[PDB]
Symmetry: D2
Subunit: 295 residues, 4 copies
């Protein structure tokens, strides 16, 4: 037998950082969960019990904290690139670092219509994420995403004209509820190294904001023919607005809300045009994916 | 042996309702999870296998949907009171109904600075809840709450002057992070029945809003001497603003963020006044409770 | 306003302890999650910012570890009583301690039909729990429980003869699936203090084992007329086998498995006597409770 | 823009099946969660709102139930292959089916030392899984796995001789706790189609059993030099015992249990050779992966 692939590191490293403006008194907080996995010439730790090649996962944890102390943690695309580059440059025998960052929301509170200098609220479990792969001699590959964005529209969704055969019971509809949890990922063109990532720093927050705005507006305004058709519209617009993105991937559950026939009870009308009360279904759920790239 | 207490019913009943304004085209959605448990002369179902006394839990589920079809579902204090009253009036041998409702957020989307007529976002997992106990001959007892309100302040929290003995290692501090998940419950004076609950309908949403506002403002503005002292201030203000509330209960975890000493690494300074990077602790957590009533 | 009730302490304290037999080489592990909440003359910490009355929650955490170092941690009824007694005896102004312990399974591995001296498996998320309330001048109240015991029987469950009215759609049945997650609690007679708890030490593990065995056997062997009837049989037997128990409480969800009518597809028969494939329902679920005591 | 990749289907489809032996009265239950995602000539559903190419996800759900009615559901490798093959053969324009199955434990109860004919217990959240990819003209690729197998050993784990530099604080150790949740996957050689999968049916359950046994025995008996070294031993043995496996992949968290220094309290000794009470850490955790193949 032989080692075909190996990677190891530290997962679930929670990190908080505060920035204090001494001039204005305003404080800003960042909180993330970080995972770093390394690859390189480490096979002998598996095959020969040779620990001399192992950068201890405990040390990886220390390094994350030290790196956060000495560098900006925002945008996360930059922080992840700094962190990954550190490992491949510091250790001769480590040739790839894989950094995953989940950013948690701490949104500044408004108290009496004024932004508070040091108080924050977690407004939703929506996350902003990055996956950064730093590979020696091959540059930096960055995938940015948003996830956990949960939305619902109560009308202006349709689904008709699908294949019907002996396995089909679903009725065609011209008016249904559409609800989903959005997972959207945009993949950047490969960067040659840290200098190039630094040169594009302003684009990272701006593209996240654009991706979010396009997702929300398109969902709200599209008279949707299907999840497939609406998601493609979203992806098309993101690609049009940021030339440095190569592909956009969406993964959308279709979270079903079923009509409840109440006609058995005193002829109560609660279906079709008379539908008011519905039963949200926890499972199963449709799952629709697509990756859109350039012609 | 004898049955000392018994209750049974249906839990985890998910319900969605939409309201459509035909005049304006505006739609409003409500989504809840409902539990209804009944008590009464039902001992023989346990002791003698006498099912004749059992209103099937499946029927309880049907009743929830039918009641939602025929009545407003907001405020939840009213809906819960209607639902509970139904069971004690309809069934001679049922003498108490216990209704728990969890309301999920569906907040109308703003698209281009305009409220959208039929599109919604789940902005946070914060819930508004009610517990309604309807007891034949004893009226209606309502406890309203908010839960899952997660906040953090990065300064203006202190904790010093606590008991020190041979079990104590905690250092006194004049500047720390304070973060919690707020669970706040206000208990209404007993109501004589549905007519009285109806007479107070406007107070329910207004008191929820007040409870939320007082919680947020007090948390943000108090130079906190302890979780205990800050929570008492919150409760005092709610009681002062709504005379129909008898007690206010808060249950607050203290979600700890620890300093990280980095001095072992090149004398890096990251403690006390130099603290920038902290480690959020998943567990353990302080848990502080209090119930405040009138003199 | 006035403080009507207050309690505070530390939750989610994870503790592991190992016992090493030097003679045999055999090691035994225990892992628990502990919560301790205190009450007493602590109102001024809430109302006057007087921290002098506060035993810091951090110190409570230290005390749990120290107590586990110096005492047996099994049975949990004994450990909880030792821990609670400590606080009321050590601190003049603390008058009640409330200790909750969740015990996690680490079951010794069998390797080649022989018990291994130091290797363990988590066989299920079933827990054994205790709630111990130690109140100065009022003794020690102990509630022991098992929870998270998930079972299913595929036949020998019935449900017919229930109330039918205009809210009823459920069909009577003489053969259904019954599945539940068992939560069973037995409440001990009040103990005068630690000496009395110590005198009954052997009864704690034996009664847990009896409660588990009675639950499993009764579930498997009863031709069940309802969840209500089967659960009462369980409780009756536990009370008969341990005179020091005052009450037994069961709380059982009814986790529904629905028939799937496939007749629309080529006349496929999958209902009643021909039912083979079913759809487990995640929600809603029946919830049935009862507390059984002595005549 | 262009569609680069697309797949869609139904996730979280819960399925239960019962087998009844009329001769012996013995019943056996199977419960799974199934996901099926399809690929093929479906781009126009995204780009042109052409639903004519869509097999509705609702129909996919129906098909899962019908297939379970008409075929054995065990071993899951066979069921998944039948299910995936159905879609590529039935629909001209569907060219790949991706089937994921999670099998839940329902272990027959022993009552009074005798196996019960129709009563079952969920003994642990350990799962047996399959991923089956059926691709038209390219055969059937099957990855089998076990996951959620949680184990701990209290001694006979070491970790010393790792890289030490200015980022290192971890002390070398010759005696520590080792605990993990095992995720192990074995990848079968490509199969030409359903006939070939059928020909190897007995190997599926036998190889799962071998993988489990090798994992448990090796964990218990290895005087572990590191997670890396122990996991490689496991993988090597599985490959040696089943020639039809091409690769074995393990992914293991290192779930840390920390010593607690209690020396500050009355010189209490709880470190090194005197360590009895430890603090399980919820996060962070080491994460170690490896894929082992043939020379
Ligand atoms: O078994 C281990 N492997 C590792 O790579 C490691 N790093 N810290 N502790 C460790 N333990
Ligand atoms: O065992 C049951 N008890 C009940 O109260 C009930 N209601 N519906 N189905 C039921 N099954
Ligand atoms: O606000 C606090 N209250 C407490 O009771 C406590 N105990 N430790 N830290 C604490 N912080
Ligand atoms: O938008 C949808 N897309 C689909 O593929 C589908 N299948 N059933 N319902 C559906 N809705
Ligand atoms: Na390198
Ligand atoms: Na009544
Ligand atoms: Na006392
Ligand atoms: Na095909």
């Amino acid at each position: 037998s032989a080692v075909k692939a190996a990677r190891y590191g530290k997962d679930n490293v929670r990190v908080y950082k505060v920035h204090k403006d001494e001039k204005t008194g305003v404080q800003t907080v960042y909180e993330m969960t970080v995972c770093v996995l390394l690859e390189g010439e480490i096979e002998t730790s598996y095959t020969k019990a040779d620990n001399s090649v192992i950068v201890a996962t405990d040390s990886i944890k220390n390094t994350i904290y030290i790196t956060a102390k000495q560098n900006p943690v925002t945008p996360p695309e930059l922080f992840g690139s700094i962190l990954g580059t550190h490992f491949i440059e510091k250790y001769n025998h480590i040739h790839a670092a894989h950094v995953n960052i989940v950013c948690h929301r701490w949104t500044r509170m408004d108290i009496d219509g004024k932004p508070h200098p040091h108080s924050f609220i977690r407004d939703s479990e929506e996350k902003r994420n990055v996956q950064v792969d730093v590979v020696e001699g091959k540059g930096i590959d960055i995938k940015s995403s948003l996830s956990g964005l949960t939305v619902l529209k109560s009308t202006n969704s349709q689904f008709w004209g699908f294949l019907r055969d002996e396995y089909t019971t679903l009725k065609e509809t011209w008016d249904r509820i559409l609800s989903t949890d959005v997972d959207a990922t945009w993949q950047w063109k490969n960067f040659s190294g840290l200098q190039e990532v630094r040169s594009h720093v302003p684009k990272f927050d701006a593209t996240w904001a654009t991706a979010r705005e396009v997702t929300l507006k398109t969902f709200a305004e599209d008279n949707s023919a299907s999840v497939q058709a609406t998601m493609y519209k979203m992806a098309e617009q993101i690609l049009a607005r940021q030339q440095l993105i190569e592909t956009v991937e969406y993964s959308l559950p279709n979270k079903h809300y079923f009509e409840i026939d109440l006609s058995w009870h005193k002829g109560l009308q609660n279906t079709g045009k008379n539908a008011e009360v519905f039963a949200p279904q926890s499972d199963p759920n449709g799952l629709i994916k697509c990756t859109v790239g350039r012609s």
